[PDB]
Amino acid sequence: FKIDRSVVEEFLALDPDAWERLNADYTARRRIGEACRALSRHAFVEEDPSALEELHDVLALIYQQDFSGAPVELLGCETQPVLRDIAAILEGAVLAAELDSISEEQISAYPRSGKEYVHWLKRVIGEHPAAGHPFYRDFVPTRATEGDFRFYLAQETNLDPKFDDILAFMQIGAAPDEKMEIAGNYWDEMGNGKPAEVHTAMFAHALDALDVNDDYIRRNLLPEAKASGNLASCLAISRRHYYKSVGFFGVTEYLVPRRFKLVVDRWADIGLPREGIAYHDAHISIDAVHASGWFKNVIAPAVDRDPRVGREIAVGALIRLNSSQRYLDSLLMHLH
Amino acid sequence: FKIDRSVVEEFLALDPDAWERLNADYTARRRIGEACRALSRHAFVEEDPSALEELHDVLALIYQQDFSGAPVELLGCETQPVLRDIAAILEGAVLAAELDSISEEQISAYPRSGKEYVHWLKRVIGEHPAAGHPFYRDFVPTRATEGDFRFYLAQETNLDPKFDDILAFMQIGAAPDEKMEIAGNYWDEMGNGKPAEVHTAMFAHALDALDVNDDYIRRNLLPEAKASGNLASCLAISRRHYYKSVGFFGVTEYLVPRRFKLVVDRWADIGLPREGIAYHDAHISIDAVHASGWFKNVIAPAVDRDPRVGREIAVGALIRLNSSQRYLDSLLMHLH
Numbered sequence: 001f002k003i004d005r006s007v008v009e010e011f012l013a014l015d016p017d018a019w020e021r022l023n024a025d026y027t028a029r030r031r032i033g034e035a036c037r038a039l040s041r042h043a044f045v046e047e048d049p050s051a052l053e054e055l056h057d058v059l060a061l062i063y064q065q066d067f068s069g070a071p072v073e074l075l076g077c078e079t080q081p082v083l084r085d086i087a088a089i090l091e092g093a094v095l096a097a098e099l100d101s102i103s104e105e106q107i108s109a110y111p112r113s114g115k116e117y118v119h120w121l122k123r124v125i126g127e128h129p130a131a132g133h134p135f136y137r138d139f140v141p142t143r144a145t146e147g148d149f150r151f152y153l154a155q156e157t158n159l160d161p162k163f164d165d166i167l168a169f170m171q172i173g174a175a176p177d178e179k180m181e182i183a184g185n186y187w188d189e190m191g192n193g194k195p196a197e198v199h200t201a202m203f204a205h206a207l208d209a210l211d212v213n214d215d216y217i218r219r220n221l222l223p224e225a226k227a228s229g230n231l232a233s234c235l236a237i238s239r240r241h242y243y244k245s246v247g248f249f250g251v252t253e254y255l256v257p258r259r260f261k262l263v264v265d266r267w268a269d270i271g272l273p274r275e276g277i278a279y280h281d282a283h284i285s286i287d288a289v290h291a292s293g294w295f296k297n298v299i300a301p302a303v304d305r306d307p308r309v310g311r312e313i314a315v316g317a318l319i320r321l322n323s324s325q326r327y328l329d330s331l332l333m334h335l336h
Numbered sequence: 337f338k339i340d341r342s343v344v345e346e347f348l349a350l351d352p353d354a355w356e357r358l359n360a361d362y363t364a365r366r367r368i369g370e371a372c373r374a375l376s377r378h379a380f381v382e383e384d385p386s387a388l389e390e391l392h393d394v395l396a397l398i399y400q401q402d403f404s405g406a407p408v409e410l411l412g413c414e415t416q417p418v419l420r421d422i423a424a425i426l427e428g429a430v431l432a433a434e435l436d437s438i439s440e441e442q443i444s445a446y447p448r449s450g451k452e453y454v455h456w457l458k459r460v461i462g463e464h465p466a467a468g469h470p471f472y473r474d475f476v477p478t479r480a481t482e483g484d485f486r487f488y489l490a491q492e493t494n495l496d497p498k499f500d501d502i503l504a505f506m507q508i509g510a511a512p513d514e515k516m517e518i519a520g521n522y523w524d525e526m527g528n529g530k531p532a533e534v535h536t537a538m539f540a541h542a543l544d545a546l547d548v549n550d551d552y553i554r555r556n557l558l559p560e561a562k563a564s565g566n567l568a569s570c571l572a573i574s575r576r577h578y579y580k581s582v583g584f585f586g587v588t589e590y591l592v593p594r595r596f597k598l599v600v601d602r603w604a605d606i607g608l609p610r611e612g613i614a615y616h617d618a619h620i621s622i623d624a625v626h627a628s629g630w631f632k633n634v635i636a637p638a639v640d641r642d643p644r645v646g647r648e649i650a651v652g653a654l655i656r657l658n659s660s661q662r663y664l665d666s667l668l669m670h671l672h
């Protein structure tokens with residue numbers, strides 16, 4: 001028995017009684033798990049490109065159930081016993097592969113106090129090529145066309161359309177200082193209460209401005225873009241990945257202003273719809289404040305509370321940087 | 337093989353390799369599930385009081401992992417395959433028992449438009465005895481002592497200490513109007529950014545004012561209080577329970593002002609610490625606004641979007657009312 005996206009699609013078509021029957025059958029569930037481990041092996045031991053994309057198509061479908069409003073037809077279907085087993089197996093393989101790229105020396109030399117840790121982390125980020133990737137530094141200012149930006153924005157649907165809920169998952173159970181900062185960040189994503197300023201709505205308008213429609217996205221989404229989106233989902237939704245999440249989205253906020261400024265200037269230079277740039281325009285200022293608040297009020301207090309979490313935060317930062325690098329290298333390569 | 341709280345405690349003591357070994361052994365996992373179904377039968381078919389409390393002690397331990405910041409020692413432990421199977425089985429039994437108390441006629445006669453549905457729901461709530469329970473209407477104004485309030489507050493740790501995260505879970509994936517309202521409610525729970533006004537912090541101060549310490553809570557928490565807390569957790573953390581959640585916490589906001597006004601007036605009448613009443617004092621005004629916003633901006637738009645969800649919202653409201661009734665009846669009975 002093989003597992004792939006269509007198999008999980010079929011699962012999600014079952015009615016509530018079919019799900020209950022599947023959930024009671026641990027022989028069928030063992031078979032599902034074994035199929036997941038085999039898919040994992042093809043994806044990350046063999047590194048078969050098709051199996052890797054299949055694995056991320058499966059994870060993306062499951063996270064869709066975690067992150068999207070459930071349809072009325074699914075309300076009685078107990079999907080957690082099977083979907084969480086599938087996600088645990090494929091996630092474990094995805095994360096083991098990220099960790100294979102991270103050395104112990106990268107994640108252990110940090111100072112064991114909060115303010116010092118922030119300086120160290122900013123330096124560690126600055127050394128990574130993703131912090132100044134040529135897609136933003138060279139390709140965008142000098143060559144990016146409307147067709148380029150439309151392809152790029154399609155990749156970016158992996159993260160931006162769900163940033164508010166990533167923050168809402170993350171802050172669950174967080175200590176007070178960290179929680180307060182993530183809460184204020186979430187409230188900013190929610191337009192501070194003004195529907196026109198909600199960030200997902202403004203991102204959607206940029207997508208409409210370049211006709212980044214759902215079918216264009218489906219055809220053009222890169223495997224590395226899928227993996228980036230899946231990593232962000234994976235880390236946000238488990239409490240135990242919280243400190244990884246802190247590093248992963250700390251890097252994210254930190255890098256947005258330099259990246260979006262390059263996109264915005266080029267977007268205006270080639271006369272693209274001023275309506276669409278509003279999303280990126282906004283974040284250039286906002287995320288300088290978000291990055292500063294995140295370092296000062298999330299990362300530094302967590303490290304001061306328990307310096308052992310500096311290692312987790314560093315892992316999550318490097319996961320963000322490494323996966324961003326693979327995504328931008330693949331993106332630039334497809335854009336020629 | 338039997339399952340109980342201590343067995344799940346032992347699971348949570350395993351190291352990451354032990355969890356990985358357990359997760360790969362579907363024979364051990366089948367045995368765990370079968371033990372859960374047997375515990376369920378004792379709890380809800382036999383209605384053995386001890387098995388029922390054991391079942392809710394197990395669920396409470398699992399939800400603790402879902403809602404609490406993970407300790408550094410647990411960060412590498414993949415608990416989802418087993419804990420989610422246990423939760424799915426015990427939850428299914430808890431919810432089937434709630435639904436046994438809900439008739440089809442209760443949840444089908446509603447008007448299929450949002451503003452009308454709100455009037456109908458408010459009437460349905462008004463007919464339930466939990467909407468004017470004698471614990472608040474008779475016992476509190478005339479007899480409640482400091483020792484009574486301390487016992488009561490211990491029961492209330494089932495819900496209030498996690499209300500902000502219940503809202504954060506709920507709003508995941510919500511449609512825009514509903515999301516905006518839940519977001520503003522969450523931001524209010526977060527003191528609108530002022531740490532002194534964060535609601536969990538003010539609830540904790542009321543607990544300190546009466547010495548509602550962790551050991552007092554552990555000894556005095558009633559089984560119905562545990563079930564109330566577990567219901568709230570169960571509904572909030574699954575997307576498919578969202579519309580139940582909408583009814584469950586809609587009833588919650590609606591009932592707070594009348595309930596807290598009675599508690600506050602009596603608290604002041606018997607000279608208890610003015611510091612502690614600040615929590616309840618605040619909510620009397622705030623939750624009149626929260627209830628109005630919830631009906632107008634969560635319930636009515638959801639029903640106007642898809643009237644089929646009126647049935648789910650009604651189920652969740654009645655689950656709240658029924659479980660509140662059992663909890664307050666048991667509470668009043670223990671207070672003599």
Ligand SMILES: N[C@@H](CCCC[NH3+])C(=O)O
Pocket residue numbers: 156159160163199252255256259283
């Ligand atoms: N997609 C952006 C992050 C935007 C964060 C959402 N507010 C990036 O990869 O740089």
Ligand SMILES: N[C@@H](CCCC[NH3+])C(=O)O
Pocket residue numbers: 492495496499535588591592595619
């Ligand atoms: N424990 C309260 C609900 C308080 C809601 C938290 N802000 C009740 O049962 O009425």
Ligand SMILES: [Fe+2]
Pocket residue numbers: 163189199283
């Ligand atoms: Fe944003």
Ligand SMILES: [Fe+2]
Pocket residue numbers: 185253286287290
């Ligand atoms: Fe931001």
Ligand SMILES: [Fe+2]
Pocket residue numbers: 499525535619
């Ligand atoms: Fe509150």
Ligand SMILES: [Fe+2]
Pocket residue numbers: 521589622623626
């Ligand atoms: Fe409220």
